[PDB]
């Protein structure tokens with residue numbers, strides 16, 4: 001097709017939870033739009049100073065009133081969301097995903113995606129990467145790799161608090177598998193009920209380019225397979241390699257599409 005000049009503003013809001021293909025989707029949107037897409041990895045590798053800004057936004061989020069109409073204090077929070085997202089064309093992953101309903105109002109011309117997968121596969125992936133059980137020794141290896149990246153308790157609070165925000169729950173027993181499975185199902189159901197159908201595309205993990213591209217009115221990138229990155233196995237290798245080399249820059253060339 002023809003080449004058109006696309007606006008550098010949030011055009012796609014992805015409500016999918018972590019471990020539902022968000023990093024692949026991030027990569028795919030960057031291939032389509034040639035501008036950056038937000039993701040937790042943006043925070044980790046490019047913008048660690050934004051950790052505190054997101055935590056502040058989550059803390060004050062109780063002041064939001066579901067619009068319409070727009071109250072004054074909702075606007076103060078909405079304005080900070082826009083600043084954090086300046087220069088990006090899309091959002092995925094924590095901490096943004098729980099803000100999907102507010103992002104729809106801030107960016108009324110944006111389309112909304114929901115990525116879903118088998119709930120047990122999701123839980124098992126989350127346990128290996130994001131939220132191991134308290135008694136799991138792997139939790140200590142994840143912590144040791146995070147130190148190499150400059151991440152500490154503040155980053156852990158943002159991860160946990162942004163999941164609590166997405167699930168709308170302060171008393172979340174992160175060690176309880178049944179609790180997390182119920183929150184996952186209820187979250188995904190609630191997105192489908194909140195977003196107008198003309199604005200929403202529900203994607204199952206592994207669907208590939210075609211439905212996404214039709215939804216966005218763009219051509220399929222020629223000669224490019226749909227990204228497949230960020231498996232729990234690859235996340236395990238990253239953690240092990242960070243612990244071994246004690247720096248990111250010594251190993252970054254080994255993860256070309258992930259990082």
Ligand SMILES: Nc1ncnc2c1ncn2[C@@H]1O[C@H](COP(=O)(O)O)[C@@H](OP(=O)(O)O)[C@H]1O
Pocket residue numbers: 017018019020021022023024121125205206207226227228229230231232233
């Ligand atoms: N194109 C694709 N097809 C199937 N699964 C994919 C995929 N891209 C990513 N994934 C899976 O999505 C999960 C990563 O999601 P996120 O990037 O949101 O953390 C990983 O699951 P596993 O941990 O089960 O391998 C990864 O294997």
Ligand SMILES: O=[N+]([O-])c1cc(N[C@H]2CCCNC2)ccc1CO
Pocket residue numbers: 018019040041044093094129130142145146149159230235238239
């Ligand atoms: O799903 N992830 O990839 C994901 C991973 C982490 N922690 C990883 C980051 C890299 C160092 N080792 C620990 C934190 C949040 C998310 C949510 O995106």
